[PDB]
Amino acid sequence: GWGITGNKGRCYDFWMDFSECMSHCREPKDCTLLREDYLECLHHSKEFQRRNRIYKEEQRKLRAASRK
């Protein structure tokens, strides 16, 4: 849970939230929201897929307006 320039890493906070959950929650689910939070920090998969959908719909509209 370190960082490339010290400073608590990027989401050692999200991992602490996902570990405190997995500490005192008896199931792997009901602690999965925090797991998806932490993996979102790691790979930015949700953020990148949303940005790409934004840009994709924009590009489709622009191409439909350009070529028609």
Place this chain on the structure above:
Amino acid sequence: IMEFAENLVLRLMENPEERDRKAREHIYEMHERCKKIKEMWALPIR
């Protein structure tokens, strides 16, 4: 006869508790049928 054949047979006697033996054997194996189904469940232990 020959002076001891009478007590020569009391080298075993009924003592019928060997059926409670299997009675509690069965408790053993009823629990043991949970040998392979159990696995990791604890994420709250150390």
